[PDB]
Amino acid sequence: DIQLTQSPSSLSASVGDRVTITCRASQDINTDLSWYYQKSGEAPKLLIYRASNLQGGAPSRFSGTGSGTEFTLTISSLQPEDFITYYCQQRYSFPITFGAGTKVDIK
């Protein structure tokens, strides 16, 4: 299968800090990818679509970039609401796969 690695596995930082998360693919997938966010108890939703298009309604502090086998999400200023989990999902040929998942913590 197409293995997807999320880094860092976990992180702890104060509020307002500028932070980065990376999703690496096993092989080249072009730019058919998306990023979802979730907290326990709530249904997942898509935060970023195609790694280049900002989803309607999302705060602008989030930014997505990259291509091929390397994609990046940057938060300029962390918020209390931003302490959640994230998943990079591939909308490519079958089957369908999901990332390991990365968490953000308050120190």
Place this chain on the structure above:
Amino acid sequence: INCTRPNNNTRKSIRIGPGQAFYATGDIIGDIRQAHCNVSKATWNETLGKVVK
């Protein structure tokens, strides 16, 4: 429904005028029997019964 004509036919051509052709039946080669149609029985009976009901 199956319907058939078993008889054999030929054909012929005759000239009338300038570039005018006219086709007339030729001769027959063997015996002659009447063309006819066939259908099933049980299918007909059951269909009529359903229609009546």
Place this chain on the structure above:
Amino acid sequence: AENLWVTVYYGVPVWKDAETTLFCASDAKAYETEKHNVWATHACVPTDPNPQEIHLENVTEEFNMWKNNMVEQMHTDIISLWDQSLKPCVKLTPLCVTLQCTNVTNNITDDMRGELKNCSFNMTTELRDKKQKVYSLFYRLDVVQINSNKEYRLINCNTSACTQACPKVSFEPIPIHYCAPAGFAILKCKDKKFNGTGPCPSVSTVQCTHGIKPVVSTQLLLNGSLAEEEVMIRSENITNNAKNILVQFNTPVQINCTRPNNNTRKSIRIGPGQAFYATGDIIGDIRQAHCNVSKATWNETLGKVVKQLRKHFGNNTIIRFANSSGGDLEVTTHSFNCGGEFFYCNTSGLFNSTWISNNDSITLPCRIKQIINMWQRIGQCMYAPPIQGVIRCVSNITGLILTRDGGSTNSTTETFRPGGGDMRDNWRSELYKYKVVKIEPLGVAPTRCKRRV
């Protein structure tokens, strides 16, 4: 500044290519009387003077006359116009009947032995009870024998019966013009050495083509255009032996055709308001119609053509011209029209020469025909009424159609024979410098400006 918003423009100059229906345009001079003619009917809008031409620069466009439209279109239009004009004329059904025929010994020269036949037959009158006896003359190429006694019949009787041509009609062609409606443009390539396919940098646009004269001929072209630099040769794939070759001359050549014979006319009644025209009597000695061209002119023109053609099959080669291979009477001989008549001339004395590496006049005979089936159709013939008095016309030779014969290995020699037969090529020889395009006014582009509320 970096961020930008879309913007819209209108009336941008961009175009593509497509096809559409054209229409006609005729000079007002033809509208002045001359109400009797197959073409040149009054429906054409009168033309306009002082045509204008717009120049373009920095452009380059590809042309391909072989895969071109607006050729079949005018072909169909010509056929339809002919059929429409021929419609209202008397029929010729009752003439199919046995005939009694004999020779004509009236001081004929030896070459014409048996070329005229004097025939007589029976024919009904206006009142259906009576019948009458009549007679006429005919040429050998219109009657056939069937089987002591002598009898003959018409040649087309067993195939179809066709209409006699109406008396007062003119076959003289005249200039015509083609124009396109609004929303389309016509482009022309003005390069004087462009060889009929490929790129062209010099272009211009027009609204109506120049004059065009419809003419029907085989094995030659008459009253065409004249090149400006030198004799040019065109073809689709010259290496292939199955495609014709068109040769366009640089200067014209003159030719005189004549029929010295003399004729009269006679009328007969067939039925209610049905008239029929038949040949009368001959007045004196009779001679074959014939045609003349010069000698030195033909010699030098052939020399120039060979020299130009040499640039494709190597200089170490031999060339030999041969007459038509053979076949039916319509392709094997050069046929043409002059003054409401139809001739058939044998061109054996023109393509009889060879070329190796490193006040006299040529005269040829012709023959006459009176039943014609042109445009290679079946079941449609005609009748040409005779004319009174001698005839003579003069024209110009401007182009040739050749076909290369097959060969074996590299025999350092090649042969060519006249070909033709399909009238499409005749139209194609003219409309090889015109293209039709369509406009697309809309447009879109990004711009730094942003709309105000």
Place this chain on the structure above:
Amino acid sequence: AVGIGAVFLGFLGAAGSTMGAASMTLTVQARNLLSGTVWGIKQLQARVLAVERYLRDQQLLGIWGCSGKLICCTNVPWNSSWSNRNLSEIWDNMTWLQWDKEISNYTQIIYGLLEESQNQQEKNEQDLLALD
């Protein structure tokens, strides 16, 4: 008189210049659209075709909310996903045909965005005017 001639500005002949200069000369083309038995029937077909062609363009311009002008702005933001390059080269060295063949694929979406944008604008303005 003896040396004075005539120099007019004609039909579409400016299609050999940069992307920018051509736009300076557009109006002329706009003023050349509605110019006005088998041997005469086709004229009716031609006229019908011409009028239909003109009306289609009129309607299409009408819907986008830019009717009555030759240069109109809008609100839809451009996206570099469709194309690349910068303003300088685009408006300095290019031709209209080159741009046409460049942007050929992504046209329907660019058309489609405009009408929904205009609809949102109109709907918001209606309430803005009706609140008082």
Place this chain on the structure above:
Amino acid sequence: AVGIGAVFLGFLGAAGSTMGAASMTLTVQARNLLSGTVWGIKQLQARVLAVERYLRDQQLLGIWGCSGKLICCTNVPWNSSWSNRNLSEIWDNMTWLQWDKEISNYTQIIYGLLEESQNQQEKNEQDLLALD
């Protein structure tokens, strides 16, 4: 990609909703009015009739001084005689077809009021801009 289909927003199928929703999807319907030897004459006549209809209602809209827009307010007050009702029910429950059927009696009366209102307004404002 894989696993995504395609959704559109097509023809009159939105004609069973309430008053509010339908007016979102006006534009598409407005776009579908000019789509494009004895058989030719009848179809030619049909095309001519369609073009004539389009021109007629375009002119009629033009007279009321609301050209180039899909929405337009005007000054004529609404008499309670025709149908009292009230805003909530009309804008919530009533559908288009039944409303048309129920106000099918007083169209000609309504048109003249708009016409004269525009005429008088334009005549009045002409003097104001004239004295300027």
